[PDB]
Amino acid sequence: QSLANATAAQQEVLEASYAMVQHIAKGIRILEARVARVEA
Amino acid sequence: QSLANATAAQQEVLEASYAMVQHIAKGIRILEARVARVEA
Amino acid sequence: QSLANATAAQQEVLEASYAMVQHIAKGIRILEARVARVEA
Amino acid sequence: WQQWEEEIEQHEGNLSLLLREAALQVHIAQRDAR
Amino acid sequence: WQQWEEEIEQHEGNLSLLLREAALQVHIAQRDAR
Amino acid sequence: WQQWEEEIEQHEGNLSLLLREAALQVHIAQRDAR
Fold first, then answer.
1. Could you list the residue ranges forming a coiled coil in this record (chains A, B, C)?
2. Could you tell me if F21 lies within 8 Å of chain B, comparing CB atoms?
């Protein structure tokens, strides 16, 4: 039981880390568009 | 058995998340080079 | 015992991945400030 | 950049699939332990 | 960008909280297995 | 930026090492459960 609980807790970390990484990717994309404008 | 299976499944997520994070780092590096050119 | 060991090993990966993601966020922020200067 | 974009989309698709499978397996283990 | 910043700070806060809870649960399981 | 680069390389090296050790431990647990 306690190891299953720990594994489930880690699963919540995996889901949240993925959501944060997606947000980070979004930030890079927002910034790349700004860089393309300055290059233009 | 089922908890070992779940742990192995999480291991695949860890390997893939690392590969995605590396790709994200690569993107930041590609963009920094472009920013350095515009600064120049 | 061995599954608890594996789970603990995965916990170290989760802690380190988070620290790396934070570093990546820091890099995007450093670069955004540089982009804002070029835009100015 | 287009290649970087195509590649990040592939990483995301595959990671989402692996996360879903892990979540399912975690549920099965939780149910077995209960 | 300000919105992106506010959002990344929320992600970080919540992820730090979840990491701490997972670490605690991992410790409990390790102690039980010993 | 150079410092940021040096630091990301250190994070990557250490994360790769931890991933390999976790994978090994996961294999051992899988074999024990079989």
1. 1-40
2. no
In this structure, are residues A33 and B29 in contact, taking their beta carbons and an 8 Å threshold? no
Method used to solve the structure: X-ray
The answer to whether domain C1-40 has CATH 3.40.50.880 is no
Instruction: Bin D18: left if φ > 0, else alpha if -120 < ψ < 50, else beta.
Output: alpha
- Residue found by looking up tokens 């992820």 in the block: E15
Nearest residue to C15 (alpha-carbon basis) of F30, E5, E24 = E24
* Closest CB to D19 among A4, A18, A25: A18
| CB atoms near residue E7 (< 10 Å) | 14
Query: Which residues of B are less than 8 Å from F12 in CB distance?
Result: 22, 25
What's the alpha-carbon Rg for chain C, to the nearest Å? 18
Domain edges within chain B: 1-40
Tell me which residue of B11, A5, F3, A17 sits closest to D31, measured CA to CA.
A5
User: CA-to-CA distance for C37 and E8, rounded, in angstroms?
Assistant: 22
